[PDB]
Write a protein that binds this DNA or RNA. Structure first.
Ligand code: MG
Ligand code: MG
Lengths: 55, 143, 104, 75, 68, 189, 171, 145, 144
RNA sequence: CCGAUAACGAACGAGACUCUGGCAUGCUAACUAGUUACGCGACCCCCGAGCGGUCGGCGUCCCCCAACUUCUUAGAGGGACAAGUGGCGUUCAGCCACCCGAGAUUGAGCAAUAACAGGUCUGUGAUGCCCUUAGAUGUCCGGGGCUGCACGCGCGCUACACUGACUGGCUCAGCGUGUGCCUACCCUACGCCGGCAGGCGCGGGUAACCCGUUGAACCCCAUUCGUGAUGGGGAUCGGGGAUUGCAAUUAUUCCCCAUGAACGAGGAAUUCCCAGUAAGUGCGGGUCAUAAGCUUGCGUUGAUUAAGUCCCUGCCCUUUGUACACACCGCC
């Protein structure tokens, strides 16, 4: 359709407004500390950010 | 042997303060005291008839202990355990209009004045009244 | 100028912060500025607990990740001016520094 | 063990029963007064404090959940 | 229970005893004060565990010919 | 000199048998002003023996889910029960408690696994510590089922449970259970 | 103040920037012997050092490729202009970098060397460079359709405790 | 107070069209009337100005008819607007408290109104299922078997 | 006479509840948060607060003005912190400003009455694990 | 581990290690933490105290206009080793008891070889192969569904009450979060209105600076109730009022008044657990435009029993038997 209905549905909130900043997934996001990363991608990269295991 | 409020048992102290506040009645008691619940989480109206005097006495004692307490703070003091029925219990706050009206009646009695910052505290003569009642309740408890 | 400045250091490791908070104040003493003592703010412990599995099948094991953020405050106070006196930073990677004045 | 149908208010046959031997035994509590006089128990509390006011019962405990009374000492 | 020492501490104790028998003594604190310079111990707990075993072995040595 | 709850001096309390005098702890070394002390008595074996038995009763009386931290409530219950038994009997509440413990501890029991004849294959006499533990447990249990669904409160129920157990009258659940255990063990001899 | 974000969000964002830059450099300099990236940030400016083996290869014709990547990292994260500088650094003891050895093993397998010979060569080169030990595990559809894993290990290798974190490099 | 039972003590009353136990306290006895709960009973007693510490059986006829009048007509006795049940009625739009089998028949007429307009809630009421959106998969089994 | 600077500040802990007693030369009195010692919220445990005073006698407390501040914990942990702080403050006062003879012959009565009057309880809590509701309990498991 | 010894010399795992808790009146240091002292005040006693009592009232890093670090914070260090004593022991490895001590076993993290056709291609611009690819199995928009109910099962919450419910008063925490690249959505003090849910102005905080001294709940102290399906229980259901959103019906949630159902401790079975533990009790985080009966953490109160065994269910080592080797859920 034209510009009037192609993206007309609001996505100013909710689960459809947020996606993983890495894998573009909409499930298991981590928004704490503005991380905005998927649950699995955070496990993948957590060494690089600095989140390391102590206990 | 001077007596402050901190040297008397606060329970019968606030009861005696409420009794004095009753007998020297100059309050602005609102017309809906016989209807409202003292807080959201309550399920019955307070059993005592003139509970407004007791609540004002308690707020005066709390303002003596620490100043600068606003209406939202007084809801924190008079909050309690909401049972929520079948769902698990939680914490609820006191009635905002009740706290506001108690405070407003207190500055109507001019024993409480607002701060330069937020909230309100006691005046020197309010402190004097609290200390006098504490002294007399200590004397009564002794003899 | 009559200047009184504040330098805050913050990082994820304690070794680098300790050696910076050592060498900076030592340089100040050798450059005769009277030094307000290094103040250690409480550590910020960012905790993220997450299911280990990428599937949801398993025995419900949770991996917990921590980030420790440590920060120190050093107030440099001299009767003369400070900014034209001290200019070198001598800052290694991994630590962030912010310099304000007593006004801010 | 079906029901207790306790009296909520006194009558002549139980009022004298209360007045004449209740201040004679050692342990006076609202619970025991209720179970040995077949009265409700709020009635028991009220009657016991009436006997306190009349001054023929001695109080020892006065707790919010357990009040104990005793008779006046003899001799 | 569960106070059995391992190869690391036992071998370190025997080696330093046969290398520094003169300097060592029967005092645990003195023997743990000599270890920081007669050896390089990565851990304080390891160091004082070794020192305790050194004290034990030297008591045994002064009472008889241990295999050290 | 110590006067538990402000009265009821501990020095006149007498343990009537030597079997449990090393495990009852009302004597002056264990005399405490108040039955509440976080003394770490369960850290090591046999440490509860030197714990005062009033503390043991207070710890045992707080049971059945609703009541697992309410030790202040349990202390006030014990205080009221001691007041009640002093009024009802005239002697030392601690003496009444000690007599109740001694008469409530079951002297022998029966325990086994295999093809049991009546209850258990063998009859087994018990230790003094197990005597004290079982007696306290039985007294608190009897008070609990006495006070569950009647107007008579937990203070009076505990009080008259101790009163009945101190003499031995078959009206106390503790010694009723004790006699049942004695019969079972005697049959399983 | 209101313009700057909190320290928690700031450190998390710095870690995210490091991880994103590392992923991009890994996917871009894969055939160039990429090893790692080290960023030194100052309020004045920031410096990005790319540890690799083939510096002359990561640098294009007269620095064309390093200029290209500098402009890319400039635009993608929106630094002020001239506030980021990219340096390429040659690593020392390339046999000790697990990233470089894994990348070289992948290159060999893509070229078409037998997995057995390639892994033996990688292990031999690593131990020739000098390490307490090495272990290469190759898993997948080796031989038939059914998948298998071959582990080639020599020397010392710890697995548990803290010291694995600063003694073992894993790629 | 604490006297014998009074001579004109009836053990149960006849209020509206239902009997209330005079053995219990007044604040809780009239709760046996449908449409009256603890809060409503307490407020109507307070605005009837009756001692709350007395049983329902020992009240006199003038007091009990005062309670009748206040319960029937709470608007003129300073009962606040928000306190009532049938607020803003679907039929006539008038604020009323309902006190008796009037509550039963008003519930019946509201449910049959929903059924007549064939609303989804009315259909659920007709079929005997849950109407407040609950999950019918695992609970409510007793009401059927 | 008027000898100043006779003061100690000694703390006592029980389950992250601290109490700092500021013992000082003066008349004999003990107050907690500006309130009298005998007047405390959990009045059931009043003997736990009065236990050092009763054990040692009012004679030794007659020469000290003690003020206690508490800023943590619950109720009974607070009470234990206060009693430990008072006992430790008195023994520190008797250790510094008077003879260790008196220090020893009050510390003994304190010790073989109750060690916790002078030695802090080390136990605090235990971290919850991800398999159950508490530190050691596990969620109920099922097989069918 | 000591020792034996056709083995010798090693390697991994265990341990060691890291984080955490408990002690440091010892060191360094603090206006984003305080304490003490002093000085202004405010109130009581003022009979008469007067260096009397209270103050989370105001000041002394406002720069000359007090010190100090106990309490808080966080670094560097120390501290505990079966070290000391007694006994047992081949008097070895070790074990038991006690003194002194904060502590004589604080909890976690990591965690070998080999393997499972265990789970995920619905985390990925990880991916082979097959399928589809313009009337699409791509993508977007609207609506519905994922909730739907004769029924069975699992994880839980609420209860069956007086060791309690209601009403009021008094008095105590610790984790930890808080305004955003896209991306709009923060935590909130105080003042006013409303009975409540809420609404309206004025601020503070990108944070040891503000919420906040996180005035939490249980508990404690008083009131009523009175052994009844009762003032227990709050399911179901009616009417009405707000909030979020583009939209609340199949009720988002919240609030008020009404209805007060089963339930009176639970068959056969069965789970978890040894000390600040179980359990009671609330509070944070995740999810979140709206939201927790879930989960992950935190504190508060705080026990009974046990310091043993192989009986059941299993595990490890050795010997042994085997017709098993897809390995006893075998084989026959
Ligand atoms: Mg290990
Ligand atoms: Mg009710």
């Amino acid at each position: 359709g034209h510009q009037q209905l192609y993206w007309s549905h609001p996505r100013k909130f909710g689960q459809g407004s947020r996606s993983c900043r890495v894998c573009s997934n909409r499930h298991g996001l981590i928004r704490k500390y503005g991380l905005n990363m998927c649950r699995q991608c955070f496990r993948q990269y957590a060494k690089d950010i600095g989140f390391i295991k102590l206990d | 042997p001077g007596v402050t409020v901190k040297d008397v048992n606060q329970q019968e102290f606030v009861r005696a303060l409420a009794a004095f506040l009753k007998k020297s009645g100059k309050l602005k008691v609102p017309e809906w005291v016989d209807t409202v619940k003292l807080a959201k989480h309550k399920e019955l109206a307070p059993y005592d008839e003139n509970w407004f005097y007791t609540r004002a006495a308690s707020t005066a004692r709390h303002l003596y202990l620490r100043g600068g307490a606003g209406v939202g703070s007084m809801t924190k003091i008079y909050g309690g355990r909401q049972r929520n029925g079948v769902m698990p219990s939680h914490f609820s706050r006191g009635s905002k209009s009740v706290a506001r009206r108690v405070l407003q009646a207190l500055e109507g009695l001019k024993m409480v004045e607002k701060d330069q910052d937020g909230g309100r505290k006691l005046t020197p003569q309010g402190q004097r009244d609290l200390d006098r009642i504490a002294g007399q309740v200590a004397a009564a408890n002794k003899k | 100028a009559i200047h009184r400045i504040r330098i805050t250091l913050t990082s994820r490791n304690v070794k680098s912060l300790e050696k910076v908070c050592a060498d900076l104040i030592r340089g100040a003493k050798e450059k005769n500025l009277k030094v307000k003592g290094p103040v250690r703010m409480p550590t910020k412990t960012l905790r993220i607990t997450t299911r280990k599995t990428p599937c949801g099948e398993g025995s419900k094991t949770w991996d917990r990740f921590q980030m420790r953020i440590h920060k120190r405050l050093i107030d440099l106070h001299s009767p003369s001016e400070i900014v034209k006196q001290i200019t070198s930073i001598s800052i290694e990677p991994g630590v962030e520094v912010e310099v304000t004045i007593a006004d801010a | 063990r079906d029901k207790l149908n306790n009296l909520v208010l006194f009558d002549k046959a139980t009022y004298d029963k209360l007045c004449k031997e209740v201040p004679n035994y050692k342990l006076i509590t609202p619970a025991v007064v209720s179970e040995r006089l077949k009265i409700r128990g709020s009635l028991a509390r009220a009657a016991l404090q009436e006997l306190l006011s009349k001054g023929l019962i001695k109080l020892v405990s006065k707790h919010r959940a357990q009040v104990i009374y005793t008779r006046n000492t003899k001799g | 229970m569960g106070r059995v020492r391992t190869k690391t501490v036992k071998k370190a104790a025997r080696v330093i005893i046969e290398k520094y028998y003169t300097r060592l003594g029967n005092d645990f604190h003195t023997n743990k004060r000599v270890c920081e310079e007669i050896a390089i111990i990565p851990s304080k707990k390891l160091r004082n565990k070794i020192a305790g075993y050194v004290t034990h072995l030297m008591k045994r040595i002064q009472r008889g010919p241990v295999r050290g | 000199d110590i006067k538990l709850f402000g009265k009821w001096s501990t020095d006149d309390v007498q343990i009537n048998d030597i079997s449990l005098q090393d495990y009852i702890a009302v004597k002056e070394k264990y005399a405490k002003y108040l039955p509440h002390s976080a003394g770490r008595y369960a850290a090591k074996r046999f440490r509860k023996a030197q714990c005062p038995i009033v503390e043991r009763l207070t710890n045992s009386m707080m049971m059945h889910g609703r009541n697992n931290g309410k030790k202040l409530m349990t202390v006030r219950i014990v205080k009221h029960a001691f007041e009640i038994i002093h009024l009802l009997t005239g002697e030392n509440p601690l003496q009444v408690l000690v007599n109740a413990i001694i008469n409530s501890g079951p002297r022998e029991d029966s325990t086994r696994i295999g093809r049991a004849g009546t209850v258990r294959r063998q009859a087994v006499d018990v230790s003094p510590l197990r005597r004290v533990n079982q007696a306290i447990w039985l007294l608190c249990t009897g008070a609990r089922e006495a006070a569950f669904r009647n107007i008579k409160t937990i203070a009076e129920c505990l009080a008259d449970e101790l009163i009945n157990a101190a003499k031995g009258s078959s009206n106390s659940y503790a010694i009723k259970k004790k006699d049942e255990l004695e019969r079972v063990a005697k049959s399983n001899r | 103040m209101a313009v700057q974000i909190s320290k928690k969000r700031k450190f998390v964002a710095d870690g995210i920037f490091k991880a994103e830059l590392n992923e991009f450099l890994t996917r871009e300099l894969a055939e160039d012997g990429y090893s790692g990236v080290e960023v030194r940030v100052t309020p004045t400016r920031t410096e990005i050092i790319i540890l690799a083996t083939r510096t002359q290869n990561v640098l294009g014709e007269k620095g064309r490729r390093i200029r290209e990547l500098t402009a890319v990292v400039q635009k993608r994260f929106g630094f002020p202009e001239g506030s980021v500088e990219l340096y390429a650094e040659k690593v020392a003891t390339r046999g000790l970098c697990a990233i470089a050895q894994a990348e070289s093993l992948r290159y060999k397998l893509l070229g078409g060397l037998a997995v057995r010979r390639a892994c033996y060569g990688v292990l031999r080169f690593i131990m020739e460079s000098g390490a307490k030990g090495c272990e290469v595990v190759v898993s997948g559809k080796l031989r038939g359709q059914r998948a298998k894993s071959m582990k080639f290990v020599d020397g010392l290798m710890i697995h548990s405790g803290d010291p694995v974190n600063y003694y073992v490099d894993t790629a | 107070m604490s006297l014998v039972i009074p001579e004109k003590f009836q053990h149960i009353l006849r209020v509206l069209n239902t009997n209330i136990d005079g053995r219990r306290k007044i604040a809780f006895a009239i709760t046996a009337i449908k449409g009256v709960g603890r809060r409503y009973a307490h407020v109507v007693l307070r605005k009837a100005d009756i001692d709350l510490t007395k049983r329902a059986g020992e009240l006199t006829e003038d007091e009990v008819e005062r309670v009748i009048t206040i319960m029937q007509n709470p608007r003129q006795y300073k009962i606040p607007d928000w306190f009532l049940n049938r607020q803003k009625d679907v039929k006539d739009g008038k604020y009323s408290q309902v006190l008796a089998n009037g509550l039963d028949n008003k519930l019946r007429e509201d449910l049959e109104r929903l059924k007549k307009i064939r609303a989804h809630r009315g259909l659920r009421h007709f079929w005997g299922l849950r109407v407040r959106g609950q999950h019918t998969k695992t609970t409510g089994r007793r009401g059927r078997t | 006479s008027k000898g100043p600077l006779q003061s100690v500040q000694v703390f006592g802990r029980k389950k992250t509840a601290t109490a700092v007693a500021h013992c000082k030369r003066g008349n004999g009195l003990i107050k907690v948060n500006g309130r009298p010692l005998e007047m405390i919220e959990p009045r059931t445990l009043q003997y736990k607060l009065l236990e050092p005073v009763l054990l040692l006698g009012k004679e030794r407390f007659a020469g000290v003005d003690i003020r206690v501040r508490v800023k943590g914990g619950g109720h009974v942990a607070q009470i234990y912190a206060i009693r430990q702080s008072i006992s430790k403050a008195l023994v520190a006062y008797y250790q510094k400003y008077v003879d260790e003879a008196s220090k020893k012959e009050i510390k003994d009565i304190l010790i073989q009455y109750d060690r916790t009057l002078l030695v802090a309880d080390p136990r605090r809590c235990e971290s919850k694990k991800f398999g159950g509701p508490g530190a050691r309990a596990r969620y109920q498991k099922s097989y069918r």
